[model samples]
Target chain A: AAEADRTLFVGNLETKVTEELLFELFHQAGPVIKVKIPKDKDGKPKQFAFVNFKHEVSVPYAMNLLNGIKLYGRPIKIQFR
Target chain B: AAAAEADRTLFVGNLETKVTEELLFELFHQAGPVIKVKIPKDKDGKPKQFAFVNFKHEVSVPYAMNLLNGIKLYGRPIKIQFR
Candidate 1:
């Protein structure tokens, strides 16, 4: 597989999870640059989000430890998507 | 959430200890393009005998669960469940 960038694909999220919540959770791994949860035309939150970190090193650090970790009662799936 | 989208993913358990991520991708890809393969580990970081297979679409979930269940891989019978 190609190497992952500084950004990570975060999935299996609860619809109610907010950007700030994700930011706070992922911030521990490194400096969080941005957190985004795409929405449908009707404005419902998508089940997945993308999280960007400031350094490339943080990408794998977060992915390896947080891949199957649960938050808000759901085990979030993380990958290089 | 919402009982997990059965069509989006499946919980594959009772896997052989020798199974690798690449081997899983090759087998599950027959049903559809597998997006991710997560073989979780024990607290001590040993590979557990299960994994979560994420498919690109809902169509592949049932196809994999039905067709792959009871199939022998690495000399072990694998089990499949809709996640």
Candidate 2:
């Protein structure tokens, strides 16, 4: 949060992962303020998601802990989304 | 002919619809030798109001830097990118 790189945008999620699954996984480390999953015109999940945390602290903490870490048997990629 | 020519780089946005090929070629002509100039189309394959210019030398980029931005042509600003 206090660090300049604290703000982050996470993306490239497995289509199967749902809002509850993300909340369940990330909530242990910090507070997640909001999560937005945009859909295409056809209503299918997009390959991206935008997240905001109460403090920039929570963002990277989530990234560092989760990046290249296995979720649903695949490593998740996190970047400045 | 003495020193190596500098290449000018330009990105002009907010192009006027009435601007013709002659008008565009003449406007950016003041920089060094303009290697190439053309308007680019957007995702829909429609020409946008922006043009990109590549000049023979960097001096042209500086020259472009001087005339564009607040030049007040087309009632907007132009952006130049340096190689």
Candidate 3:
């Protein structure tokens, strides 16, 4: 496993969840630098994403508050990536 | 929000206390490549009875649920549900 980064590992992602949607949701916690939901061979979602906040301080706050919030009825899980 | 949940994510229920994230990762890997394993804890920071396993591909969800569902983790049988 890699050492934790400024990026947060967002699990339990819906296929319809896009980088834009993640930005909007996580932006509520703090300023985010980038949002990446990796894709499979078919260019479909990988069911998890890496959200890079503008500051490391936002990572824990976002993880704690938004970890279980619903996205398309699936409770999204989060951790330090 | 859509009416149907994502095919790549599964809701694991009734997990045993000794079932760590590493165990679930190994167990669920029988179906496909697992991308993320999350075991949410309570306010007391104790591992909850349930967790979520996210697969790398949608195809893994069906196979993983069928293969791993009701399988015992520790001494208890685990439950699987689509989220």
Candidate 4:
């Protein structure tokens, strides 16, 4: 489905979190449209990824809650992709 | 390696239920010594109907495939994909 109004966001986080784990974690905020961790480029985590929320209510929640959070001992950068 | 033997084995729904390294190995041992058999496992530990078997001869595999394909075991069709 073509999405409007809601732009998906990507976060740079520790590679330790898997697609399944991220889906479980983010679904708590609301319905999650999709969560993807692209395969590493050149054998290292891509340093970025995309998260789509099923509705607008979840986007700000993720951006606020996830920004500056330390995961696997690394401070992640989050933003709209 | 004789082209790496692969034999075909079949089972059905709870297709998930009757499959495992041991159950599949037992079914196709009639054709040849099974070198390796694998069913894709999901993160949740559930399995699909598909599985793979390596055997001593490709001929037995085809023979087994024809004999087993539409035969229902526990009420399911068994099919094979050769790799």
Q: In terms of DockQ, which candidate is strongest?
A: 3
Model 3 lDDT at residue A20: 80
Predicted model with the maximum TM-score: 3
Q: After superposition, how far is residue B65 of candidate 2 from its true place, in Å?
A: 58
What is candidate 1's lDDT per residue for A25-78, written digit by digit as tens?
A: 789899999999999999988999999888888888998867876543467899
Model 2, B15-54: lDDT tens digits are 6765554666677776556777778778998777777776
- The residue ranges of model 2 lying beyond 4 angstroms of the native Cα positions read A1-7, B1-83
Model 4, position A24, has a per-residue lDDT of 60
- Model 3 Cα shift for residue A3 (angstroms): 60
Question: Candidate 4: lDDT of A59?
Answer: 74
Docking class of 4: incorrect
**iRMS per model in Å:** 11.5, 23.3, 8.4, 22.4
Worst 10 residues of 2 chain A by lDDT: A1-10
**If candidate 3 were superposed on the true structure by all CA atoms, what would the RMSD be?**
15.2
Model 4, residue B29: C-alpha shift (Å): 47
lDDT score for residue B55 of model 4: 65
| Docking outcome class, model 1 | incorrect
Tell me the TM-score of candidate 1's A chain. 0.88
Query: After TM-score superposition, what is the CA distance of residue B21 in candidate 2 from its true location, in Å?
Result: 78
| Candidate 1 lDDT tens digits, B6-36 | 4477888888989887898889999898888
Residue pairs with backbone atoms closer than 3 Å in model 4 (clashes): B5-B54, B5-B55, B6-B55
Ranking of all predicted structures according to lDDT, beginning with the best and ending with the worst: 3, 1, 2, 4
RMSD of each: 14.9, 16.6, 15.2, 16.1
